[PDB]
Ligand binder design. Structure first.
Ligand SMILES: *Cc1[nH]c(Cc2[nH]cc(CCC(=O)O)c2CC(=O)O)c(CCC(=O)O)c1CC(=O)O
Length: 290
């Protein structure tokens, strides 16, 4: 006579791996709950949750919409994985060692624009596929290197030595929420929220909250060359690095804010960058994306 928590999940191997990881972690609490996965886009999952067809969903935080519909909430952010972008080179060159005219594979304008801002003599080309697929294309096709999230490589079990070079935020500011998971549920589901609380990692949640406020006030998302990475410093301060880039890498807006309040920090970063023209650039890229 236990409540069975229905967890909706995307069909991919990464999404199901993340979903099962969360369920296994909640089971460590030894509380009287059962768990079941229902394979299920973001609108679809949120509708089913609002419809009570499912009780919760596990998303990569960088895939979460900046704005959740009324009634839903992020109920838990667990301990962050590696936040960094990772460079994997076919022949093992670091970024500064790649040959002139090297082609780096990524469909992310955030990633590509930042790389082009460092070296405009390389080329960024679209690529698709899960990690396994992109790694195969690196060996067999006309890419000299690809960019992947360190977090996805880790969660898929790839060795740390698969990575040629972990890119620090000073080279490539990560996508907002990269390496973090979001557990979404109904805001009034106090029983599930109580179960989720022990899995929540307050330091990760506070940093990501600052990133997400910046994202929301810039009206950012996946397709946008916008980036933000927050971290907790000794003493409780959050340091937020925020960035907006033109697709060609020749315009870079960058802002560093260190303070106590994640909402104030995120809001100030957006205010400063908006005043410099970064929001106009975001709007124009959105229009071109049609
Ligand atoms: C918004 C966006 N999504 C993806 C693809 C993606 N989403 C989640 C992951 C795994 C890591 C995580 O959960 O943090 C991935 C795969 C990955 O980042 O390697 C992207 C990247 C598209 C690409 O580079 O082609 C993005 C855009 C962005 O990172 O800004």
């Amino acid at each position: 006579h236990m409540r069975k928590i229905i967890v909706g999940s995307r069909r991919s191997k990464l999404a199901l791996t993340q979903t099962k990881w969360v369920i296994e972690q909640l089971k460590k609490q030894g509380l009287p709950f059962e768990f079941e996965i229902k394979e299920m886009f973001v609108k679809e999952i949120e509708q089913a949750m609002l419809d009570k067809e499912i009780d919760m969903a596990v998303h990569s935080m960088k895939e979460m919409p900046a704005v959740l519909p009324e009634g839903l909430t992020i109920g838990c952010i667990p301990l962050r994985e590696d936040h960094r972008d990772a460079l994997i080179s076919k022949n093992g060159e670091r970024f500064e060692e790649l040959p002139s005219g090297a082609v780096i594979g990524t469909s992310s304008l955030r990633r590509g624009a930042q790389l082009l801002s460092m070296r405009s003599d390389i080329e960024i080309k679209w690529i698709r596929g899960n990690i396994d697929t992109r790694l195969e294309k690196l060996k067999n096709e006309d890419y000299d290197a690809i960019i992947l999230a360190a977090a996805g490589l880790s969660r898929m079990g790839w060795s740390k030595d698969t990575v040629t070079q972990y890119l620090e935020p000073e080279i490539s500011v990560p996508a907002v929420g990269q390496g973090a998971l979001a557990i979404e549920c109904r805001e009034n589901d106090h029983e599930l929220l109580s179960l989720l609380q022990a899995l929540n990692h307050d330091e990760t949640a506070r940093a990501v909250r600052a990133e997400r406020v910046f994202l929301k006030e810039m009206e950012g998302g996946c397709q946008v060359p916008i980036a933000g990475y927050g971290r907790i410093l000794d003493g409780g301060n959050i340091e937020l690095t925020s960035l907006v880039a033109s697709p060609d890498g020749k315009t870079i807006y960058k802002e560093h804010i260190t303070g106590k309040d994640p909402i104030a920090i995120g809001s100030e970063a957006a205010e400063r960058l908006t005043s410099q023209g970064a929001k106009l650039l975001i709007d124009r890229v959105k229009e071109e994306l049609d």
